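Quick entry between incubations.
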Amino acid sequence: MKTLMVFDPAMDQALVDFSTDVQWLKQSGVQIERFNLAQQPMSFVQNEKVKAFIEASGAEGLPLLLLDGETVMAGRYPKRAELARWFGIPLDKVGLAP
Amino acid sequence: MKTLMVFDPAQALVDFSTDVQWLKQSGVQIERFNLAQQPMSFVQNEKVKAFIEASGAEGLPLLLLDGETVMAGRYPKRAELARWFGIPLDKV
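Done. Structure below.
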C-alpha cells in the first residue's frame, strides 16, 4: 500500500478538518503517519527531502506531504477528496459524494 | 537573487499575477509554464515529471526556487515571496 508521511509545523479550522479527514482515510485501510517539529524533530533531519525542503522554503513552508517518498503537496493540507485521489479510495468509502 | 519556476495548471491567481509583476520590476527572474502551452516542460524537468506522476496534475501549481520545491498545491502570498527572495521590510 502507499504511505503518506505528513511533516507538520510545530503548530484553526484547516488543522481540525485535516484531522477529521485523516480519520476517514485511515479507516478505509490507508497508511498515514504524521511528524511535527515539536514532538518528532529528528524525523525532519533524517528524511533527505524534508531537510532540503526546510532549507529551501523555510519551516514556514510546512506542511510537506510525501506519498511513497515523493512530494505531493507543500504549504497547505489536502482536502478529503485529494487524499481519496492519492490513495485510489472511492469517495463513498470516506464519507464523500460527487 | 534566487530564480523562480512556476508550473501552472492548464482570486489567488489574480493576486499572484500582480505579485509576479512586482517581483519582475524588482529584477527577479520568474518563468511560468502551463500544460496548455508549454506541456513538454512538464516532462523535461524531472522534478515536475515526478510531481505530476505522484500527485496528479490536480496537484498543481508547483513552485521551484533555484530548482528546489518550495510550494505545491497553491500559490504563495506576497509575504511568502518576500521571505524566499530576501526582500527586506519597508521602514515606518
